[PDB]
Ligand binder design. Sequence first.
Ligand SMILES: CC(=O)N[C@@H]1[C@@H](O)[C@H](O)[C@@H](COP(=O)(O)O)O[C@@H]1O
Ligand SMILES: CC(=O)N[C@@H]1[C@@H](O)[C@H](O)[C@@H](COP(=O)(O)O)O[C@H]1O
Lengths: 166, 165
Amino acid sequence: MKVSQALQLTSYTEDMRAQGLEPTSQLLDIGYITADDRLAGLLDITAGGRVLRIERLRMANGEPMAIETTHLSAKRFPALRRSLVKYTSLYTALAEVYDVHLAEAEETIETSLATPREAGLLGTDVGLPMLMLSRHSQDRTGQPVEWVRSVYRGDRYKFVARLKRP
Amino acid sequence: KVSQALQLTSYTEDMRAQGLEPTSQLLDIGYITADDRLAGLLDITAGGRVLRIERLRMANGEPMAIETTHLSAKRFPALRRSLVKYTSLYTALAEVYDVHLAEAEETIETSLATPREAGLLGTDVGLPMLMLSRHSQDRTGQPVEWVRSVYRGDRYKFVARLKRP
Ligand SMILES: CC(=O)N[C@@H]1[C@@H](O)[C@H](O)[C@@H](COP(=O)(O)O)O[C@@H]1O
Ligand SMILES: CC(=O)N[C@@H]1[C@@H](O)[C@H](O)[C@@H](COP(=O)(O)O)O[C@H]1O
């Protein structure tokens, strides 16, 4: 009953088309923030630097799946906020508008509980275990492009990884 | 929350990969009968004998996970004393049986702690847990193990390196 998601450097839009499900999104909030030392180091920008923050509800066939909050350097991508009016896929926007392509990412997987707001958005009981993911991605020139923190419904997701003995 | 890269390594290797000292407690070990599910996973006949091993995993002495391992009993004679000997299942597999893991599929999910798990892990019933399953095959292409582990949600995180094909 859970979606089985392969761990791979792919977009939510790509992932849902793999599942044969229709991906839609709801822009919960978008705008600029000032980076603290942590976010500055992750995006290789000067402390105090401006960060585009994008928060989206990701749905599969109209049902809430996850809330994703993505962070990118506003200085590098000043027209990206506006460009997302035209693109549903962030990765597609980066490729077509800025010729930026992701090459490597580190993804972290943890579990914890949703905030009251998240639980309301996802339609889950607030006591439901959730899958808390982060993704730190870099492009083909080795520059960090995004830092993403996400909350995936614990009752709808499992992740799958292929392991190899080195 | 302590980090741990997803790759085909043992608990022992992963712990020594950090500065953490791995210890385990053997909770139980015994034979069960395989249902169709397990029989398929281990490539034995339904009704076949499976060795189930239950271990408590500690990092620097603090309880971290309960790990339940399933293997074909017929394939691994004297596995119990061999596990006592080497402590690492993977070391035992290599040294005793000349069995070497080549590939595995790992599943990562959430769950809630059962009363048994909460008691063993010194935590609360209903604490969010990370539930990981590993299905591994050896260099002959044969499945070796099917493992299910429950990690304290407040103490563990798993890390994966992604690269675009
Ligand atoms: C790691 C994670 O939880 N989600 C990633 C996220 O890092 C990325 O920003 C998004 C872009 O999807 P889009 O191109 O469809 O907007 O795809 C994935 O879902
Ligand atoms: C959920 C999982 O992947 N558990 C793996 C398990 O499949 C594997 O049998 C175990 C081996 O460790 P050991 O040699 O006993 O120290 O390492 C665990 O981490």
